[PDB]
Design a binder for these strands. Structure first.
Ligand SMILES: [Ca+2]
Ligand SMILES: [Ca+2]
Lengths: 1072, 266
DNA sequence: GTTGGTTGGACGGCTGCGAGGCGA
DNA sequence: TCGCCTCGCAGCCGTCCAACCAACTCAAA
C-alpha cells in the first residue's frame, strides 16, 4: 500500500554527484592534491562516526544523530502498540493546504471530512506538541475563504437574478480561464449568499446588499479576485483561510494550548492511520473547528527543540581567498555545526559536527566542553559534499527542530545550502519541512527571507541589529559586547591552510565552528526572541512565521478585520519650532507626548469610518459638538465624534492600551518566569499600537487612508504649536509660574526669567528655562506637563516631562549633544568618533566635546558666542574662557610633530580590494604604500588585506622615491596619496608626520560639532579654530645661509630685544 | 588704551596710498615687522629679497611699546592687512588705525578702516576690520651697512640696464665701474654704458664713483622683479666688502621699495 | 548609501608682453 | 626713424563645484 501522499524527501539513494577536495587523498602524490574531484558515484551515501560506518538514509537502532521521527519513507518505526491518547496540545504553527476527496479516497477518513474536501477543500493543519512531547498535526476541515461583491453592481452587470446564477458565472469564468487550469470546476464549488454590510470607508456610506461568496480553494479565490468582473470591487479577497479559521472561532489563537473536545453532533476528532499522515509527526487527527477549544490556564511552552547551526565553506577556484559561490561546484560546504537544545528547559542536548573529510576535535576543546557540563561533540565524517549535505537535511527532517537559529542563516547559510542542494545536486526540498511532500521550503531575497513549513527560522543577526546599537555586528564583536565573552577567531584566510593540513587541523576548524554555534545559542537564550514573536502572533491573530517575515501592516489589518466584522463593516480589496543652532547653559526641559499618534487617533476619533470628504454628510450634525472640521493638505475633512460613531482604530487602541495596563499592573506581583512572559506580552502590545499610524499612511498598502494619516500629522503639528503658545502665554513671567507651582519659589536662579520653546520635533518640545535652577525643574516640569495636558488636550493625550538638560548644543533638526541633570551625556544624530579617522583625531575630537560640556569656564564662554553674529567674532577677541579649548588644539598640533609620538595613533588603514594594476584611481594612499613596500626593501606584501599607512611630511627623500614601480604594468608638490607611508618604515627612520594633513582633519572633525557656536558657518569656525595655533616664520635654511654670507643681520630669533631693535634701525638706514 | 597705536589720516594717508599705488598686489602676502622706527614690509619676489620701510614719521601718529612684533599680512589666508592700501579697493577711504594689544609673544594687531561719507562724515567700516595675532616666533634677515657705491638712474636709464641684463643663467651679466667713472652693464649679446659722476641722458649721478668694481649676476630675476614692482627709476646700491657681494635696487618714485640681489663672489 | 580624495573644468582677478600710434 | 608709453590680449593660477571612483559595507566563508 504505502503512503496515501508520496514522501518526496530522500529515504533511499544509490547514486550521487561525488564532489570532494583532492587534498583529502592524503596518500596521493602532490601533483594531484589541488582542486576537487567532481563525478557521479554509484553507491549509497555514507557517514562515518567514531570508527563506525552507516548509510546516511538508514533508520534503525544504531544512528549517529537523534531522531524524533515516526515514519521514514512510509515505514512506521513507532514502538509496538504505540497509541498515545491526545487531549491537550500546543500549537506553534499553522499550515494551509488543499486536499481532494479523490486523492484521499484510499485514506479511511470519516465522511464528514471527505464531504469538506469534495471535490476540493482547504485543510488547516495545526502543528505542535503534546505535554508528553509527542509531535502532533491536527487537520481542521470545513474552513472556507470568502469575499463580497456589491449585489446591485453584480446584478446590473451579469444580469444575475439569484445566487445560483452568480455561481454559474464564476464557474464559467474559471472554465474559460487562460491555461484551462480550472476545467472541471462547476457552480457547485461555490456558495453565494446575500448579506447586508457596510463598506468601511466614510461616514455617509449606507448599508447595502452584498453577495458573500464562499470558495473551496485559495488558488480559485486569487484568480477570481484578479480576473472576474474587474469593474466590480471585491472585499476581503485577500483574507487567507487561516485568518478565517482564527477570526470565525472566538478566542482561537495561532500560538497556544488547545484541547480536543466533542463537537456538535457529539462528533470526535479522528486519529489518522500512519499511512495517511501528511507530516513528520508522531500522531495526526482530523477534526472540524467545533472539536477544538482553547485550553485556559495552560501557558508553559512544551518541549519544542531548537537547532542552532552554522556552516563553513571553502572556496575551491584559482583563489582560495575568494568569497565562495554556491553555483561554483568547486566551492564546497566543508563543515556544519548543529547544536540541538530543548527550548522549554534551554538545555543543550546534542552537539553535532558534520565534516567533509576526517576531523579530530582538539582535546582542549573536548575538556572545556566537559568542564562546562555540555554534551560531548559527535563528529560525523563524510567523503563528499553531497553525503554531508544529505545527512544534514536528513537530520532536519528526522529531528524536525520546530525552531531554528543561527547568525546570518537567512542571508548566507540557508541560501548557500539550498543553492547547493537545488542547483548542484538535484534534490527537491518540498518534503524536508514538516510536510512529507509539496510543502513550502524556499528562500528569496528582499537581505533575504526564508519560509520552511513547520520550521520557525529566527536569525539572531536580525534580532540583535533590531535590539542593540553596536559599531560592528560581527558575531565576535557582538559576543564581546553582549556576553562579555572575548574569544579568538579563525580567519577565513586560515581555513584553506588548516583544511589541507590534516584531520587535527580540520579539527581546529571544527572547534571554532562549534564555538560559534554555542555563542549564538547564548544570544538566543538571552534575548528569547521566540517569546516576543509568539506574543505578537497571539495578539495579531497571525502565525509566528508571518509574524517574523510579513510586514507590520498585516498585524493591524487582521485585528481591524476582526473588529470591523463585529461592527458590520467589510474591508475593500485595494516652522517656528525649528532650532537656532547654539549652546545653552540654562536648563532645557524636554516635554514628550506619550504615544502621540495613537493618542490623537483616539482623542479625535479618527477612522476610515468616521471620515467624510463631504459637507452634506454632516449637515445633519452640530459643528464642533458632533464632528471635527479640519483642513488637511488643502482639503476640508470631517471626522464625526465618538457619540455619533466610534472609530474602529480608536477601539483597537483603547482596548490594547487597557490590556497593556492590566499586564504591567500584574508584574510587580508575578513569579520570575511569569515576569518574563508578562513583559513580552506588554512589549508586543506596544509595537502593535505604534504601528497603527503607519498602517493608515502606506499608499498601496493594505487598507490605506492617507486622509487619516495626514490628519494625524496635521493635528500633531497644531498640538505642538498650541503647546508652545500656551507655555509662552501662561508662563511669560515667574510670578505666573509660581502662582501655579509655588515650589518654584526656591527654584529661582539669579538672572532674568524666561521660558521659551527652542526646539520641537514630531512629539517633543524643548523648553529653555532662563532664571530657573535645574534641580527642582524636572518635578515642576511634570506638573507643568500635567497642567498643559489638562488645559489643552483631550484624554488620552498626555504630555510628560521626559528629562532636563543642564547643557545643550543644538546643532540642527534631530542633531544635538546634551548633558542630563545627573551628569550623563546624551548624543543624538551625530557620531564623534568616525571610522575614517585615526585614533589621534577621534580622541582629540572627543576631548574638545568633553571640554565644552564639563569645563564650566569653556561652557560659559561658548554660550557667550551667541550674543553676537558669527562674522563679528572674526574682528574681536573671543570670549575669555575659551582659552582651554584653544589649548587642546595647540597641544594636538604639537603632538603631531613630536618625535616621541606613538605612530599607531596616526595610522589609517585600507583593504586591498583587488590587485593594484586593476584600479582606475591609482592615486590611493594604500597603493602608494604597496609599491613603496616593493620598491625599497621588498617588504612583506599584501593581497585582499588591510594595508596600514601614515601620512608623512615632504622631506625631499619622499620626492626622490616617488618613482613607483606601477609603471611596469606627481614630481613636485606631492599629493596626500603620494605622501602615504608604511608605519614600520616611518617608525624605523624617525620620519615626520604630515602636520597639515592631520591638523586639517582635526579641524574638519571639530567643525562638524562646534559650527553650531557660530551660526552653523563652517568657514568662520575653521578660521577661528585655526587662529589658536602659534605661527612661526623663518627664511629657508639655504636662503638664510646665503643671506648671512651676504652680510644680512638677524631680526627676532633668539637675538635680544636690543639687538633686534638696533638691527631694524640699521635696516631702515640701508633701505632708505 | 592700546600700548602701540598707528594712525593714517589726511596727508599721511595720501602719502602711503601713493607709495602703494605702483606696488599693486606685490606685497599683499608679506611679513610686517613693527617696532619703534616703523613698519618694515618684507617679501620674496622671484626668489629675491624685497623690502618696503614705512618710517614712523610717515604715519599721522606712531607709538610703539614693548618688543618688535612681526605679523603675517594675510588674515585667515584670505584678506591682507595691506589690501586697504591698494589703489581703488576702498574709494572713499578717510582713515586707518592699527592698535596692538596684549603682551609678547601673544599680542594682537587690530586694523580699523573709515570712509568719508556725505558731507565728510568719517564712518567706520566695522565689517572690514582685521585682527591678527603676532608670530609667536620669527626670524628675518635684513640688509645692513652703507653701500660701497651708489648710482642713481632715472626711469629711462634703469630700463636700459634691465634690457642689458641677462636673459638666463646661461648668459650672465656683468656690472662694472671703471677708473674714468664709466659705468657699464653687459652680457653675451648686448651692452649699455653711462658716465657716472659724484653729486646728457648718459650722465648718472652717484656716490663713491671713484670706487671701481666688477661684479656678475646669473639670474634674469633682476629684470622680472623690478618690472613686477613697477620701479620707475632707482638707486643701484653695491655692497662689495662681503663674501657674497650684493646689489640693492631702491626705487625713487612714490614707492620706497627695494629689491636685493646676490652677486657672484669676486 | 555615503562620504573622501581627486580631477577636470568654468571662471575671475592679475600681470606681463607685444604691437601700434604718437611725438620728438 | 627710433624710442617710449599705453592698451589689449593671452597665459596663469587659485577657488569652487560637480562628478567619479572606491572603501566600509560586513557579515556569513
Ligand atoms: Ca552563519
Ligand atoms: Ca560560519
Amino acid at each position: 500500500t504505502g503512503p496515501t501522499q508520496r514522501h518526496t524527501y530522500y529515504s533511499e539513494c544509490d547514486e550521487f554527484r561525488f564532489i570532494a577536495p583532492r587534498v583529502l587523498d592524503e596518500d596521493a602524490p602532490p601533483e594531484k592534491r589541488a582542486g576537487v574531484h567532481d563525478g557521479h558515484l554509484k553507491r549509497a551515501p555514507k557517514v562515518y562516526c567514531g570508527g563506525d560506518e552507516r548509510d546516511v538514509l538508514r533508520v534503525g537502532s544504531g544512528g549517529f544523530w537523534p531522531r524524533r521521527s515516526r515514519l521514514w519513507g512510509g515505514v512506521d518505526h513507532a514502538p509496538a502498540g504505540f497509541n498515545p491518547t491526545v487531549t491537550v496540545f500546543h500549537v506553534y504553527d499553522i499550515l494551509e493546504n488543499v486536499e481532494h476527496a479523490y486523492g484521499m479516497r484510499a485514506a479511511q477518513f470519516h465522511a464528514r471530512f471527505m464531504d469538506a474536501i469534495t471535490p476540493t477543500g482547504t485543510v488547516i493543519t495545526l502543528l505542535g506538541l503534546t505535554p508528553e512531547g509527542h509531535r502532533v498535526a491536527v487537520h481542521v476541515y470545513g474552513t472556507r475563504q470568502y469575499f463580497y461583491m456589491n449585489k446591485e453592481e453584480v446584478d446590473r452587470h451579469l444580469q444575475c437574478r439569484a445566487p445560483r446564477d452568480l455561481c454559474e458565472r464564476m464557474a464559467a469564468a474559471l472554465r474559460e480561464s487562460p491555461g484551462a487550469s480550472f476545467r472541471g470546476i462547476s457552480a457547485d464549488h461555490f456558495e453565494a449568499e446575500v448579506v447586508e454590510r457596510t463598506d468601511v470607508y466614510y461616514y455617509e456610506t449606507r448599508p447595502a446588499l452584498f453577495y458573500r461568496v464562499y470558495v473551496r480553494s485559495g488558488r480559485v479565490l486569487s484568480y477570481l479576485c484578479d480576473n472576474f468582473c474587474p469593474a466590480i470591487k471585491k472585499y476581503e479577497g485577500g483574507v487567507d483561510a487561516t485568518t478565517r479559521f482564527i477570526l470565525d472561532n472566538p478566542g482561537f489563537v495561532t500560538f497556544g494550548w488547545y484541547r480536543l473536545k466533542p463537537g456538535r453532533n457529539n462528533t470526535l476528532a479522528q486519529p489518522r492511520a500512519p499511512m495517511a499522515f501528511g507530516t513528520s509527526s508522531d500522531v495526526e487527527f482530523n477534526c472540524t473547528a467545533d472539536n477544538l477549544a482553547i485550553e485556559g490556564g495552560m501557558s508553559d511552552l512544551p518541549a519544542y527543540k531548537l537547532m542552532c547551526f552554522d556552516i563553513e565553506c571553502k572556496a575551491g577556484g584559482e583563489d582560495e581567498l575568494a568569497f565562495p559561490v554556491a553555483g561554483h561546484p568547486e566551492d564546497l560546504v566543508i563543515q556544519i555545526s548543529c547544536l540541538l537544545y530543548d527550548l522549554s528547559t534551554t538545555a543543550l542536548e546534542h552537539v553535532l559536527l558534520f565534516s567533509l573529510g576526517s576531523c579530530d576535535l582538539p582535546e582542549s576543546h573536548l575538556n572545556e566542553l566537559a568542564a562546562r557540563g555540555l554534551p560531548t561533540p559527535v563528529v560525523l565524517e563524510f567523503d563528499s559534499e553531497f553525503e554531508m549535505l544529505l545527512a544534514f537535511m536528513t537530520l532536519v527532517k528526522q529531528y524536525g527542530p520546530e525552531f531554528v537559529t543561527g547568525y546570518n542563516i537567512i542571508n548566507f547559510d540557508w541560501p548557500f545550502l539550498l543553492a547547493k542542494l537545488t542547483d548542484i545536486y538535484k534534490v527537491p526540498l518540498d518534503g524536508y519541512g514538516r510536510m512529507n511532500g509539496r510543502g513550502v521550503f524556499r528562500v528569496w531575497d528582499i537581505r533575504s527571507k526564508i519560509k520552511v513549513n513547520g520550521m520557525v527560522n529566527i536569525d539572531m543577526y536580525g534580532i540583535i541589529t533590531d535590539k542593540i546599537k553596536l559599531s560592528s555586528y560581527k558575531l565576535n564583536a557582538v559576543a564581546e559586547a553582549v556576553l562579555k565573552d572575548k574569544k579568538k577567531d579563525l580567519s577565513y584566510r586560515d581555513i584553506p591552510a588548516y583544511y589541507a593540513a590534516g584531520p587535527a587541523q580540520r579539527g581546529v576548524i571544527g572547534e571554532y565552528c562549534i564555538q560559534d554555534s554555542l555563542l549564538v545559542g547564548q544570544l538566543f537564550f538571552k534575548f528569547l526572541p521566540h517569546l516576543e514573536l509568539s506574543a505578537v502572533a497571539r495578539l495579531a491573530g497571525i502565525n509566528i512565521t508571518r509574524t517574523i517575515y510579513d510586514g507590520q501592516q498585516i498585524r493591524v489589518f487582521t485585528c481591524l478585520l476582526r473588529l470591523a466584522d463585529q461592527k458590520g463593516f467589510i474591508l475593500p480589496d485595494t516652522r517656528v519650532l525649528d532650532p537656532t543652532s547654539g549652546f545653552h547653559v540654562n536648563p532645557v526641559v524636554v516635554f514628550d507626548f506619550a504615544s502621540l499618534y495613537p493618542s490623537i487617533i483616539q482623542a479625535h476619533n479618527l477612522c476610515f469610518s468616521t471620515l467624510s470628504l463631504r459637507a452634506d454628510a454632516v449637515a445633519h450634525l452640530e459643528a464642533g459638538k458632533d464632528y471635527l472640521e479640519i483642513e488637511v493638505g488643502g482639503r476640508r475633512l470631517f471626522f464625526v465624534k465618538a457619540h455619533v460613531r466610534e472609530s474602529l482604530l480608536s477601539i483597537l487602541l483603547r482596548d490594547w492600551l487597557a490590556m497593556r495596563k492590566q499586564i504591567r499592573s500584574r508584574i510587580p506581583q508575578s513569579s520570575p518566569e511569569e515576569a518574563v512572559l508578562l513583559d513580552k506580552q506588554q512589549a508586543a502590545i506596544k509595537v502593535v499600537c505604534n504601528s497603527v499610524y503607519g498602517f493608515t499612511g502606506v499608499q498601496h498598502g493594505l487598507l490605506p487612508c492617507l486622509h487619516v494619516a495626514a490628519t494625524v500629522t496635521t493635528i500633531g503639528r497644531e498640538m505642538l504649536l498650541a503647546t508652545r503658545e500656551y507655555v509662552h502665554a501662561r508662563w511669560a513671567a515667574f510670578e505666573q509660574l509660581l502662582a501655579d507651582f509655588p515650589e518654584a519659589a526656591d527654584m529661582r536662579a539669579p538672572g532674568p526669567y524666561s521660558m521659551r520653546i527652542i526646539y520641537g520635533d514630531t512629539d517633543s518640545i524643548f523648553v529653555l528655562c532662563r532664571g530657573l535652577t535645574a534641580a527642582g525643574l524636572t518635578a515642576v516640569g511634570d506638573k507643568m506637563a500635567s497642567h498643559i495636558s489638562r488645559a489643552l488636550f483631550l484624554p488620552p493625550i498626555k504630555l510628560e516631562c521626559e528629562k532636563t538638560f543642564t547643557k545643550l548644543l543644538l546643532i540642527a533638526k534631530k542633531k544635538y549633544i546634551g548633558v542630563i541633570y545627573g551628569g550623563k551625556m546624551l548624543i543624538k544624530g551625530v557620531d564623534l568618533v568616525r571610522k575614517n579617522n585615526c585614533a589621534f583625531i577621534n580622541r582629540t575630537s572627543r576631548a574638545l566635546v568633553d571640554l565644552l560640556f564639563y569645563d564650566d569656564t569653556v561652557s560659559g564662554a561658548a554660550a557667550a558666542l551667541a550674543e553676537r553674529p558669527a562674522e563679528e567674532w572674526l574682528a574681536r577677541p573671543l570670549p575669555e574662557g575659551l582659552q582651554a579649548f584653544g589649548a587642546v588644539l595647540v597641544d594636538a598640533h604639537r603632538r603631531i610633530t613630536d618625535p616621541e609620538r606613538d605612530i599607531q595613533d596616526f595610522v589609517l588603514t585600507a583593504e586591498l580590494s583587488r590587485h593594484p594594476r586593476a584600479y582606475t584611481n591609482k592615486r590611493l594612499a594604500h597603493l602608494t604604500v604597496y609599491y613603496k613596500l616593493m620598491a625599497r626593501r621588498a617588504q612583506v606584501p599584501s593581497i585582499k588585506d588591510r594595508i596600514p599607512y601614515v601620512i608623512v611630511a615632504q622631506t625631499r627623500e619622499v620626492e626622490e622615491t616617488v618613482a613607483r614601480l606601477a609603471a611596469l604594468r606627481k614630481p613636485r608638490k606631492l599629493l596626500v596619496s603620494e605622501l602615504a607611508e608604511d608605519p614600520a618604515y616611518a617608525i624605523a627612520h624617525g620620519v615626520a608626520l604630515n602636520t597639515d594633513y592631520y591638523f586639517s582633519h582635526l579641524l574638519g572633525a571639530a567643525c562638524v560639532t562646534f559650527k553650531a557656536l557660530f551660526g552653523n558657518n563652517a568657514k568662520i569656525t575653521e578660521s577661528l579654530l585655526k587662529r589658536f595655533i602659534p605661527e612661526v616664520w623663518h627664511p629657508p635654511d639655504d636662503v638664510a645661509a646665503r643671506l648671512r654670507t651676504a652680510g644680512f643681520g638677524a631680526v627676532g630669533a633668539g637675538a635680544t630685544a636690543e639687538e633686534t631693535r638696533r638691527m631694524l634701525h640699521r635696516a631702515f638706514d640701508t633701505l632708505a | 588704551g592700546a600700548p602701540c597705536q598707528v594712525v593714517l589720516q589726511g596727508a599721511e594717508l595720501n602719502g602711503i596710498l601713493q607709495a602703494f599705488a605702483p606696488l599693486r598686489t606685490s606685497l599683499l602676502d608679506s611679513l610686517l615687522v613693527m617696532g619703534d622706527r616703523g613698519i618694515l614690509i618684507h617679501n620674496t619676489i622671484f626668489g629675491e629679497q624685497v623690502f618696503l620701510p614705512l618710517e614712523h614719521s610717515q604715519f599721522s601718529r606712531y607709538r610703539w611699546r614693548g618688543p618688535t612684533a612681526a605679523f603675517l599680512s594675510l588674515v585667515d589666508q584670505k584678506r591682507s592687512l595691506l589690501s586697504v592700501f591698494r589703489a581703488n579697493q576702498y574709494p572713499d577711504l578717510r582713515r586707518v588705525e592699527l592698535a596692538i594689544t596684549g603682551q609678547a609673544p601673544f599680542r594682537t594687531l587690530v586694523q580699523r578702516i573709515w570712509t568719508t561719507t556725505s558731507d565728510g562724515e568719517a564712518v567706520e567700516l566695522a565689517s572690514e576690520t582685521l585682527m591678527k595675532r603676532e608670530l609667536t616666533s620669527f626670524v628675518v634677515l635684513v640688509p645692513q651697512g652703507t653701500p660701497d657705491v651708489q648710482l642713481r638712474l632715472t626711469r629711462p636709464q634703469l630700463t636700459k640696464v634691465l634690457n642689458a641684463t641677462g636673459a638666463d643663467s646661461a648668459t650672465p651679466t656683468t656690472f662694472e665701474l671703471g677708473v674714468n667713472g664709466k659705468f657699464s652693464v653687459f652680457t653675451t649679446s648686448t651692452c649699455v654704458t653711462f658716465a657716472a659722476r659724484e653729486e646728457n641722458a648718459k650722465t648718472v649721478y652717484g656716490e663713491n664713483t671713484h670706487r671701481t668694481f666688477s661684479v656678475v649676476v646669473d639670474d634674469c630675476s633682476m629684470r622680472a622683479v623690478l618690472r613686477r614692482l613697477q620701479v620707475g627709476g632707482g638707486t643701484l646700491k653695491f655692497f662689495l666688502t662681503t663674501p657674497v657681494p650684493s646689489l640693492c635696487v631702491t626705487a625713487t618714485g612714490p614707492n620706497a621699495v627695494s629689491a636685493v640681489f646676490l652677486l657672484k663672489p669676486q
